[PDB]
Design a protein around this nucleic acid. Sequence first.
RNA 1: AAACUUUCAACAACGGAUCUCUUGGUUCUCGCAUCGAUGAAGAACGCAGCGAAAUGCGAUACGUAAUGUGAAUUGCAGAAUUCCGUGAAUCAUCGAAUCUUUGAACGCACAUUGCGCCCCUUGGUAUUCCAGGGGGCAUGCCUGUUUGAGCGUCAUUU
RNA 2: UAUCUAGCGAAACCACAGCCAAGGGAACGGGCUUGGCAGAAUCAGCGGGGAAAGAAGACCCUGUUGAGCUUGACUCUAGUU
RNA 3: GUGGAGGUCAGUGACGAAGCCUAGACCGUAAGGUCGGGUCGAACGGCCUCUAGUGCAGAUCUUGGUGGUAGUAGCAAAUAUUCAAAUGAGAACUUUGAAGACUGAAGUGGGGAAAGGUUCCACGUCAACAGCAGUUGGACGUGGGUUAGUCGAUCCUAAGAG
RNA 4: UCGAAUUUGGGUAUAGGGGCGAAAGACUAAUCGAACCAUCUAGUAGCUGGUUCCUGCCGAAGUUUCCCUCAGGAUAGCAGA
RNA 5: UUGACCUCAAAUCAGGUAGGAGUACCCGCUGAACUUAAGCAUAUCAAUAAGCGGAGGAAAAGAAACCAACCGGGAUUGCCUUAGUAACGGCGAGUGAAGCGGCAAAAGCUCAAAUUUGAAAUCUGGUACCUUCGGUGCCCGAGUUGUAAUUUGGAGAGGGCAACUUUGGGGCCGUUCCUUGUCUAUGUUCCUUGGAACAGGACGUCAUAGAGGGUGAGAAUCCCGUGUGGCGAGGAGUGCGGUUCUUUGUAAAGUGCCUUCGAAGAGUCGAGUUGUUUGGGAAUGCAGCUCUAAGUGGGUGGUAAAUUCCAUCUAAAGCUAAAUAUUGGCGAGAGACCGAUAGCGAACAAGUACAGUGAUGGAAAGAUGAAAAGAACUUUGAAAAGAGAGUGAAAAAGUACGUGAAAUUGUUGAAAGGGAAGGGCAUUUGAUCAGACA
Lengths: 206, 50, 146, 126
Amino acid sequence: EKAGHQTSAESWGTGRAVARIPRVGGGGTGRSGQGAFGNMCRGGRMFAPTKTWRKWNVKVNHNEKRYATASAIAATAVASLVLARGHRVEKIPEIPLVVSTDLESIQKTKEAVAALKAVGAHSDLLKVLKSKKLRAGKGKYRNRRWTQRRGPLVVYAEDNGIVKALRNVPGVETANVASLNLLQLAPGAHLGRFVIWTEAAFTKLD
Amino acid sequence: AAQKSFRIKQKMAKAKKQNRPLPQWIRLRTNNTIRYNAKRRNWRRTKMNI
Amino acid sequence: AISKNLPILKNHFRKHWQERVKVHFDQAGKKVSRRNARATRAAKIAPRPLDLLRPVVRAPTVKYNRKVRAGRGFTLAEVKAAGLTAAYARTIGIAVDHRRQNRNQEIFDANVQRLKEYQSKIIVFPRNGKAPEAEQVLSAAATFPI
Amino acid sequence: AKQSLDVSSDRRKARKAYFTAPSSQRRVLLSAPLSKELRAQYGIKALPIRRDDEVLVVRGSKKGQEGKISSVYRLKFAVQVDKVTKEKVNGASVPINLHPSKLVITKLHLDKDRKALIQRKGGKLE
RNA sequence: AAACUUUCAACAACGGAUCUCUUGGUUCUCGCAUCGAUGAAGAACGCAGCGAAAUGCGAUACGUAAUGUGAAUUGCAGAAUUCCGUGAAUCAUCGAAUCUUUGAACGCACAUUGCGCCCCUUGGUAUUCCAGGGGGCAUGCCUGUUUGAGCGUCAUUU
RNA sequence: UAUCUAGCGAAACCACAGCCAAGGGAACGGGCUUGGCAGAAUCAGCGGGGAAAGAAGACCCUGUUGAGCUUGACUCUAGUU
RNA sequence: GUGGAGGUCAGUGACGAAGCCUAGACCGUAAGGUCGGGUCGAACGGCCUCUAGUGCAGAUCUUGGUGGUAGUAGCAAAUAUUCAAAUGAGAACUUUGAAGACUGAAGUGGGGAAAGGUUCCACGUCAACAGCAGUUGGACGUGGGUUAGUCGAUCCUAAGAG
RNA sequence: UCGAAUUUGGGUAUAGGGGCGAAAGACUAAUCGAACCAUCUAGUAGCUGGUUCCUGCCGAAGUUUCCCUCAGGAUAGCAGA
RNA sequence: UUGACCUCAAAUCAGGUAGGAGUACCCGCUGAACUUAAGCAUAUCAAUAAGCGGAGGAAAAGAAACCAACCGGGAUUGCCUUAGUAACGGCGAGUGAAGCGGCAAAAGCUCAAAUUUGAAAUCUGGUACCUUCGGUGCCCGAGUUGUAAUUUGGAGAGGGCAACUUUGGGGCCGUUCCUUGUCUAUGUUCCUUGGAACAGGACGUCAUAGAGGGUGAGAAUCCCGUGUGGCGAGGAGUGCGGUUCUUUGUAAAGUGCCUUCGAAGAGUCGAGUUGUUUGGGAAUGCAGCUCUAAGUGGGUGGUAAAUUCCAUCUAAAGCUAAAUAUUGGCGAGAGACCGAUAGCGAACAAGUACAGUGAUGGAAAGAUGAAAAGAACUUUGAAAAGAGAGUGAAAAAGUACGUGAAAUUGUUGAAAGGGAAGGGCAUUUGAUCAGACA
Ligand SMILES: [Mg+2]
Ligand SMILES: [Mg+2]
Ligand SMILES: [Mg+2]
Ligand SMILES: [Mg+2]
Ligand SMILES: [Mg+2]
Ligand SMILES: [Mg+2]
Ligand SMILES: [Mg+2]
Ligand SMILES: [Mg+2]
Ligand SMILES: [Mg+2]
Ligand SMILES: [Mg+2]
Ligand SMILES: [Mg+2]
Ligand SMILES: [Mg+2]
Ligand SMILES: [Mg+2]
Ligand SMILES: [Mg+2]
Ligand SMILES: [Mg+2]
Ligand SMILES: [Mg+2]
Ligand SMILES: [Mg+2]
Ligand SMILES: [Mg+2]
Ligand SMILES: [Mg+2]
Ligand SMILES: [Mg+2]
Ligand SMILES: [Mg+2]
Ligand SMILES: [Mg+2]
Ligand SMILES: [Mg+2]
Ligand SMILES: [Mg+2]
Ligand SMILES: [Mg+2]
Ligand SMILES: [Mg+2]
Ligand SMILES: [Mg+2]
Ligand SMILES: [Mg+2]
Ligand SMILES: [Mg+2]
Ligand SMILES: [Mg+2]
Ligand SMILES: [Mg+2]
Ligand SMILES: [Mg+2]
Ligand SMILES: [Mg+2]
Ligand SMILES: [Mg+2]
Ligand SMILES: [Mg+2]
Ligand SMILES: [Mg+2]
Ligand SMILES: [Mg+2]
Ligand SMILES: [Mg+2]
Ligand SMILES: [Mg+2]
Ligand SMILES: [Mg+2]
Ligand SMILES: [Mg+2]
Ligand SMILES: [Mg+2]
Ligand SMILES: [Mg+2]
Ligand SMILES: [Mg+2]
Ligand SMILES: [Mg+2]
Ligand SMILES: [Mg+2]
Ligand SMILES: [Mg+2]
Ligand SMILES: [Mg+2]
Ligand SMILES: [Mg+2]
Ligand SMILES: [Mg+2]
Ligand SMILES: [Mg+2]
Ligand SMILES: [Mg+2]
Ligand SMILES: [Mg+2]
Ligand SMILES: [Mg+2]
Ligand SMILES: [Mg+2]
Ligand SMILES: [Mg+2]
Ligand SMILES: [Mg+2]
Ligand SMILES: [Mg+2]
Ligand SMILES: [Mg+2]
Ligand SMILES: [Mg+2]
Ligand SMILES: [Mg+2]
Ligand SMILES: [Mg+2]
Ligand SMILES: [Mg+2]
Ligand SMILES: [Mg+2]
Ligand SMILES: [Mg+2]
Ligand SMILES: [Mg+2]
Ligand SMILES: [Mg+2]
Ligand SMILES: [Mg+2]
Ligand SMILES: [Mg+2]
Ligand SMILES: [Mg+2]
Ligand SMILES: [Mg+2]
Ligand SMILES: [Mg+2]
Ligand SMILES: [Mg+2]
Ligand SMILES: [Mg+2]
Ligand SMILES: [Mg+2]
Ligand SMILES: [Mg+2]
Ligand SMILES: [Mg+2]
Ligand SMILES: [Mg+2]
Ligand SMILES: [Mg+2]
Ligand SMILES: [Mg+2]
Ligand SMILES: [Mg+2]
Ligand SMILES: [Mg+2]
Ligand SMILES: [Mg+2]
Ligand SMILES: [Mg+2]
Ligand SMILES: [Mg+2]
Ligand SMILES: [Mg+2]
Ligand SMILES: [Mg+2]
Ligand SMILES: [Mg+2]
Ligand SMILES: [Mg+2]
Ligand SMILES: [Mg+2]
Ligand SMILES: [Mg+2]
Ligand SMILES: [Mg+2]
Ligand SMILES: [Mg+2]
Ligand SMILES: [Mg+2]
Ligand SMILES: [Mg+2]
Ligand SMILES: [Mg+2]
Ligand SMILES: [Mg+2]
Ligand SMILES: [Mg+2]
Ligand SMILES: [Mg+2]
Ligand SMILES: [Mg+2]
Ligand SMILES: [Mg+2]
Ligand SMILES: [Mg+2]
Ligand SMILES: [Mg+2]
Ligand SMILES: [Mg+2]
Ligand SMILES: [Mg+2]
Ligand SMILES: [Mg+2]
Ligand SMILES: [Mg+2]
Ligand SMILES: [Mg+2]
Ligand SMILES: [Mg+2]
Ligand SMILES: [Mg+2]
Ligand SMILES: [Mg+2]
Ligand SMILES: [Mg+2]
Ligand SMILES: [Mg+2]
Ligand SMILES: [Mg+2]
Ligand SMILES: [Mg+2]
Ligand SMILES: [Mg+2]
Ligand SMILES: [Mg+2]
Ligand SMILES: [Mg+2]
Ligand SMILES: [Mg+2]
Ligand SMILES: [Mg+2]
Ligand SMILES: [Mg+2]
Ligand SMILES: [Mg+2]
Ligand SMILES: [Mg+2]
Ligand SMILES: [Mg+2]
Ligand SMILES: [Mg+2]
Ligand SMILES: [Mg+2]
Ligand SMILES: [Mg+2]
Ligand SMILES: [Mg+2]
Ligand SMILES: [Mg+2]
Ligand SMILES: [Mg+2]
Ligand SMILES: [Mg+2]
Ligand SMILES: [Mg+2]
Ligand SMILES: [Mg+2]
Ligand SMILES: [Mg+2]
Ligand SMILES: [Mg+2]
Ligand SMILES: [Mg+2]
Ligand SMILES: [Mg+2]
Ligand SMILES: [Mg+2]
Ligand SMILES: [Mg+2]
Ligand SMILES: [Mg+2]
Ligand SMILES: [Mg+2]
Ligand SMILES: [Mg+2]
Ligand SMILES: [Mg+2]
Ligand SMILES: [Mg+2]
Ligand SMILES: [Mg+2]
Ligand SMILES: [Mg+2]
Ligand SMILES: [Mg+2]
Ligand SMILES: [Mg+2]
Ligand SMILES: [Mg+2]
Ligand SMILES: [Mg+2]
Ligand SMILES: [Mg+2]
Ligand SMILES: [Mg+2]
Ligand SMILES: [Mg+2]
Ligand SMILES: [Mg+2]
Ligand SMILES: [Mg+2]
Ligand SMILES: [Mg+2]
Ligand SMILES: [Mg+2]
Ligand SMILES: [Mg+2]
Ligand SMILES: [Mg+2]
Ligand SMILES: [Mg+2]
Ligand SMILES: [Mg+2]
Ligand SMILES: [Mg+2]
Ligand SMILES: [Mg+2]
Ligand SMILES: [Mg+2]
Ligand SMILES: [Mg+2]
Ligand SMILES: [Mg+2]
Ligand SMILES: [Mg+2]
Ligand SMILES: [Mg+2]
Ligand SMILES: [Mg+2]
Ligand SMILES: [Mg+2]
Ligand SMILES: [Mg+2]
Ligand SMILES: [Mg+2]
Ligand SMILES: [Mg+2]
Ligand SMILES: [Mg+2]
Ligand SMILES: [Mg+2]
Ligand SMILES: [Mg+2]
Ligand SMILES: [Mg+2]
Ligand SMILES: [Mg+2]
Ligand SMILES: [Mg+2]
Ligand SMILES: [Mg+2]
Ligand SMILES: [Mg+2]
Ligand SMILES: [Mg+2]
Ligand SMILES: [Mg+2]
Ligand SMILES: [Mg+2]
Ligand SMILES: [Mg+2]
Ligand SMILES: [Mg+2]
Ligand SMILES: [Mg+2]
Ligand SMILES: [Mg+2]
Ligand SMILES: [Mg+2]
Ligand SMILES: [Mg+2]
Ligand SMILES: [Mg+2]
Ligand SMILES: [Mg+2]
Ligand SMILES: [Mg+2]
Ligand SMILES: [Mg+2]
Ligand SMILES: [Mg+2]
Ligand SMILES: [Mg+2]
Ligand SMILES: [Mg+2]
Ligand SMILES: [Mg+2]
Ligand SMILES: [Mg+2]
Ligand SMILES: [Mg+2]
Ligand SMILES: [Mg+2]
Ligand SMILES: [Mg+2]
Ligand SMILES: [Mg+2]
Ligand SMILES: [Mg+2]
Ligand SMILES: [Mg+2]
Ligand SMILES: [Mg+2]
Ligand SMILES: [Mg+2]
Ligand SMILES: [Mg+2]
Ligand SMILES: [Mg+2]
Ligand SMILES: [Mg+2]
Ligand SMILES: [Mg+2]
Ligand SMILES: [Mg+2]
Ligand SMILES: [Mg+2]
Ligand SMILES: [Mg+2]
Ligand SMILES: [Mg+2]
Ligand SMILES: [Mg+2]
């Protein structure tokens, strides 16, 4: 907020054949005389400088919110939306994809991946990995360096090692039915996330 | 001036000692970055103001 | 600056207000910090239960006297009538209010019975040593709802 | 996936830490992997390079060459193998700068301490 | 028709846009509570084998003691006794020291490397003069110690 | 001195520019319309023109813009009684 | 059409990304889009969304850079120079010798106060500087140089400070 | 004008609604009908200047009324959606 | 004459404390004007800036001389709300609180006024010893013009009667808290492009580790780290968990009944006036001057006064954690933030260089390459340099150094030009090029 304004610069008034921005006073440095404060001057304050009391968060009605996430769950069936969303699902048994509750208790990553593959997730786990790109923007040097696709969403009822087994495999996200988050059910506001429901989780939905 | 205080003659002594070119060996150091002496002074160009 | 059929507004922004804007960016911060603060008090406080026993009280004025509401402390009368002293009731997690006076019998029996049930549903460890670990119920308010 | 609240994935915080790292920290940064043989020989995967070790360049143009580490040039984040050098126009010879991660360690220079280190990591030795 | 002027292009100038960089900035959040007469913050002058500066330090001067590491430092020279070791290092850590001239800044002054006083000590034939070494002397205020003042005032002498 | 040479080498100013007559036009055109005309590249002079350059007109008016100064203009005030 | 953000095309790329050049090609009424070639060297784009420090010819606009002017105005106050030798790659300008002049002791002579602060002196030396020059310099480089019982300060008091 | 109300060095005092003035509103560091420095301050501006891509459709007003109003507002009207 | 007392002095007397800094936040003092009112003086800006004094990790506030008017509540602080409301206001412009309710945090108390009077029971200092944040003995001294125990309004005290119930002070080890150290997976296998493989292909491995950085180009698996755990070290400290030694006691406290009492802050409360301030209105706080109380009293009860009632606290002395604040400081994690004319003025020997008598003012300035491999040598040159050579993946990277736009400039090539140039529609000529035939 104090930026651009660390000068005691005055206008020179008119009558001096030169434009009338404030100008740095004094001499001997060549800053002395330069246009000041102005939003069009090198070094000036910017126009309408940004402020922290900008609205950052947003209120959504709790009920509209549920409608949204309800709808996002509804479309995790509907084979077409899931395909249309990325999500290589042509070679999976059926939709929804309900898996044995024994999944929640898997402790080890390699055993986790191996079952995800067994039930059909192979192609999607490969979409990620074959997709990691250097983020194009300046974000690439703002802690947003790489980029990739979004894997399957494994929904559990009780976490018994499954959340830790999967955590480190690219693209796979785990979630607990009782929670469930619109941002993962519909990444970037497209419907149709590939969801692998443990059976325990599937029944708790109701 | 021509009959000074020790404080002043002292300041001039430290002055003299800063009026020397770069010790050229520095130019060779790893990551060295100083090219020339950028604080070089001259009696007939910039007065030291005591 | 008067025009159109608009409601006359009163937007008090003629002092140097931009100097005194408080954005609660630390809202999530201070909740995390408040939760940890209680999780430490819980553990410091042995099996004792974070809060004290509060009395029933009838809320003041013609607008809130329908409701009943936790008051500050238990009055010297209720404490005695419920069979203990002020000085001691404090060390037993009971809040005592030297300022509150008893004018209504109903409330009085209410709080004296509230003190009976409190005493009957706690256990007070000996001064000695033992310290027969007995796990904290965390409120007391929750235990003895109003 | 970072999980502690005292690691920083901040790319700026990292690069500053590396380039401004003190000598004592660069010693461990300048670690070379032991050779296949030496690894089963010591039950140990790699070690902070040190001067009179014996090394084989398993990367770069000087792939295949080998020799004794002449100096660890911690300042330059670079190690110099006396045996791997440039000749110039004026015949003069000049060290090439090599990086421990592209070397492999073949014969260690053993101290009282160098051994106790190998044992501190959980190794066996000859 | 040249020259010249103009326009387009290639190659070469001038200039530093653009693209890509980033040990910097900016904003948010979390944790914490520690300057000083036991001389702070700031200033001045100094200090390296070869430095003007930046950084660091104080005549023990890019550092001394200690502790951890376990072999560098490196622009050049260098020492070499320091490499199975009370031990390399422009290392880390830091609990011990040194810490010029100053500064609230305190013997007095201070546009002065100006001028006193005391104590111990050393030399000069010296309690007294000169010179070297060490240790000292500001203000307000509190508690106490000692030495005092006043027909303010109590008793006690013969 | 200028002026020709060797070396050294600025500034103001610059919409684009630079031949006229009349006409009309913001009522005095370098450009527009109709005529006169019109031939490379230039040197020394010159003060007709460029309504030349130099300063967001000191004059004059407007502004619910000032300030120095004055006074039985409004409103106060140190002091003094 | 731009900067950044969610999703996606398992998009483009060191066998050459981005950029820049190009009276070469094509699409759109247009803002613009696409391609070829050349230069280049590490990143980058399409589509659905999100987002703003989002588009310049002007503001006697800000900062930087560049012209016409123009090899032009100009380099004319202080009476003045000349011949030879030496040096040197190079001499109207340096050094020496010779001549002609000047200041004319109210000095262009001989010292100081204030102020500068090393300019003093020697050796080396010409990239910049000395509005021609340069072998010369108050320039550059590297060194040397300021000796007190009696000269000053220090002591005293002045207006005054405190 | 040039032997004194002369010239002049150093030291010293006077400070901004204040100083100093053989009196010119002069002088007070190229600043004087109120010095310089920073801050309040991005002071206010009914006034001047500028206000950055394309295409498509519609498309005005200088009139009414009240205004310390007359270079401005409100109001109606015309305009779009 | 001698010894005290009171009050006042002096010491380089014995031991200590104050200054100054900083100041983001906190307690006070002091105090504008620009501005807004379309003019302007009340008002507004603003109880703001500038000035002055004083603190802390927070400060302050705080256990009701409170809110209320209820079926009453019950220290303070802060949020949500009350509310842009009650109210103030050239009633204009503008301004503007509080009680209740929900919530965060919670916590409570101590002096003064009392005869210990069968024993000043209290305390600083010196001194010797000790088990040294301290204890003991002794001696000066303080103190009756009152130091302790007791009591604090919620009470409480002196009597009298009647019974039970309860404990203090150390060691030492842990845990807790603080500072720290070390260790803990998996490819560097082949082929291709390359100067470099960290790139594409092939075949694998680890994964509670595919966060991040380094390394000759996009590296989970080359290095450091990451994840998960393990092994240590040095502190502090009475939180509490263990232990263990002293029994502090003819000590201290709690409660029932009967009786007598029941001390409670003054140039203050309050009142007049003046000024200031406040939403506070016949006056919200504050201050100056004058007047100045009382004890069934005093204060408050948001319209002045007289009378009668009622409600409600207990002033003029005091301490106190948390919830609260924080453009400063120490240490951390971050971002739909800026990307070297931007972002702090400063990404660099930046508050530098430079200006100013001074207060102050205050820049510009990042990038060869993976690596200096920073060009040996030859030749022309007085030198600088040029020309060869050489290095490099590249000199179309030569310490003028990545890319290297534009204005503007040189050269070469093409073309036009009788007082500007440039533009529109159209076609000749010259140059140049797409597509389509099949
Ligand atoms: Mg501002
Ligand atoms: Mg200013
Ligand atoms: Mg101009
Ligand atoms: Mg500027
Ligand atoms: Mg800026
Ligand atoms: Mg603006
Ligand atoms: Mg909604
Ligand atoms: Mg596994
Ligand atoms: Mg991979
Ligand atoms: Mg992408
Ligand atoms: Mg980005
Ligand atoms: Mg980018
Ligand atoms: Mg980009
Ligand atoms: Mg002198
Ligand atoms: Mg200066
Ligand atoms: Mg001076
Ligand atoms: Mg209307
Ligand atoms: Mg407001
Ligand atoms: Mg305002
Ligand atoms: Mg904040
Ligand atoms: Mg918090
Ligand atoms: Mg609580
Ligand atoms: Mg009630
Ligand atoms: Mg109520
Ligand atoms: Mg116990
Ligand atoms: Mg770890
Ligand atoms: Mg480590
Ligand atoms: Mg290791
Ligand atoms: Mg090194
Ligand atoms: Mg390297
Ligand atoms: Mg012919
Ligand atoms: Mg072109
Ligand atoms: Mg450039
Ligand atoms: Mg850029
Ligand atoms: Mg880079
Ligand atoms: Mg940052
Ligand atoms: Mg955080
Ligand atoms: Mg030095
Ligand atoms: Mg150094
Ligand atoms: Mg040190
Ligand atoms: Mg050395
Ligand atoms: Mg040795
Ligand atoms: Mg040791
Ligand atoms: Mg050591
Ligand atoms: Mg160190
Ligand atoms: Mg010493
Ligand atoms: Mg020190
Ligand atoms: Mg003094
Ligand atoms: Mg002295
Ligand atoms: Mg003196
Ligand atoms: Mg002697
Ligand atoms: Mg003798
Ligand atoms: Mg002495
Ligand atoms: Mg005394
Ligand atoms: Mg006495
Ligand atoms: Mg002429
Ligand atoms: Mg001639
Ligand atoms: Mg000429
Ligand atoms: Mg010539
Ligand atoms: Mg000139
Ligand atoms: Mg010019
Ligand atoms: Mg034009
Ligand atoms: Mg034109
Ligand atoms: Mg004419
Ligand atoms: Mg005609
Ligand atoms: Mg006419
Ligand atoms: Mg004209
Ligand atoms: Mg004619
Ligand atoms: Mg001619
Ligand atoms: Mg002419
Ligand atoms: Mg003329
Ligand atoms: Mg002219
Ligand atoms: Mg004018
Ligand atoms: Mg103007
Ligand atoms: Mg006026
Ligand atoms: Mg005036
Ligand atoms: Mg009159
Ligand atoms: Mg009068
Ligand atoms: Mg975009
Ligand atoms: Mg580019
Ligand atoms: Mg081209
Ligand atoms: Mg072309
Ligand atoms: Mg084409
Ligand atoms: Mg085209
Ligand atoms: Mg096309
Ligand atoms: Mg192209
Ligand atoms: Mg190409
Ligand atoms: Mg390209
Ligand atoms: Mg590169
Ligand atoms: Mg994309
Ligand atoms: Mg969009
Ligand atoms: Mg903008
Ligand atoms: Mg435009
Ligand atoms: Mg444009
Ligand atoms: Mg632009
Ligand atoms: Mg422009
Ligand atoms: Mg323009
Ligand atoms: Mg325009
Ligand atoms: Mg311009
Ligand atoms: Mg020009
Ligand atoms: Mg010339
Ligand atoms: Mg000429
Ligand atoms: Mg002339
Ligand atoms: Mg002359
Ligand atoms: Mg003559
Ligand atoms: Mg000759
Ligand atoms: Mg001559
Ligand atoms: Mg002659
Ligand atoms: Mg002569
Ligand atoms: Mg003569
Ligand atoms: Mg004479
Ligand atoms: Mg004469
Ligand atoms: Mg003379
Ligand atoms: Mg002399
Ligand atoms: Mg001088
Ligand atoms: Mg001399
Ligand atoms: Mg010489
Ligand atoms: Mg030369
Ligand atoms: Mg010169
Ligand atoms: Mg010259
Ligand atoms: Mg020359
Ligand atoms: Mg010299
Ligand atoms: Mg010298
Ligand atoms: Mg003398
Ligand atoms: Mg003397
Ligand atoms: Mg005084
Ligand atoms: Mg005045
Ligand atoms: Mg004034
Ligand atoms: Mg005054
Ligand atoms: Mg001036
Ligand atoms: Mg004034
Ligand atoms: Mg001045
Ligand atoms: Mg503005
Ligand atoms: Mg007007
Ligand atoms: Mg105006
Ligand atoms: Mg349009
Ligand atoms: Mg129409
Ligand atoms: Mg009127
Ligand atoms: Mg009117
Ligand atoms: Mg107008
Ligand atoms: Mg109307
Ligand atoms: Mg209409
Ligand atoms: Mg003393
Ligand atoms: Mg202070
Ligand atoms: Mg203060
Ligand atoms: Mg005020
Ligand atoms: Mg304002
Ligand atoms: Mg107003
Ligand atoms: Mg106004
Ligand atoms: Mg106005
Ligand atoms: Mg006015
Ligand atoms: Mg207002
Ligand atoms: Mg006010
Ligand atoms: Mg304010
Ligand atoms: Mg202030
Ligand atoms: Mg505290
Ligand atoms: Mg403190
Ligand atoms: Mg706190
Ligand atoms: Mg009380
Ligand atoms: Mg309350
Ligand atoms: Mg209202
Ligand atoms: Mg209003
Ligand atoms: Mg107000
Ligand atoms: Mg308000
Ligand atoms: Mg509440
Ligand atoms: Mg307490
Ligand atoms: Mg008692
Ligand atoms: Mg007492
Ligand atoms: Mg290969
Ligand atoms: Mg890389
Ligand atoms: Mg890289
Ligand atoms: Mg890439
Ligand atoms: Mg990596
Ligand atoms: Mg990675
Ligand atoms: Mg891995
Ligand atoms: Mg890893
Ligand atoms: Mg690893
Ligand atoms: Mg420690
Ligand atoms: Mg009281
Ligand atoms: Mg009165
Ligand atoms: Mg006041
Ligand atoms: Mg009233
Ligand atoms: Mg009042
Ligand atoms: Mg009453
Ligand atoms: Mg009354
Ligand atoms: Mg009550
Ligand atoms: Mg007290
Ligand atoms: Mg307090
Ligand atoms: Mg902060
Ligand atoms: Mg964070
Ligand atoms: Mg940070
Ligand atoms: Mg900048
Ligand atoms: Mg710019
Ligand atoms: Mg920008
Ligand atoms: Mg700047
Ligand atoms: Mg940097
Ligand atoms: Mg810098
Ligand atoms: Mg300064
Ligand atoms: Mg400076
Ligand atoms: Mg500079
Ligand atoms: Mg670069
Ligand atoms: Mg560059
Ligand atoms: Mg490089
Ligand atoms: Mg480089
Ligand atoms: Mg050769
Ligand atoms: Mg050759
Ligand atoms: Mg060459
Ligand atoms: Mg290549
Ligand atoms: Mg290239
Ligand atoms: Mg070359
Ligand atoms: Mg290049
Ligand atoms: Mg070179
Ligand atoms: Mg280049
Ligand atoms: Mg002509
Ligand atoms: Mg045509
Ligand atoms: Mg065909």
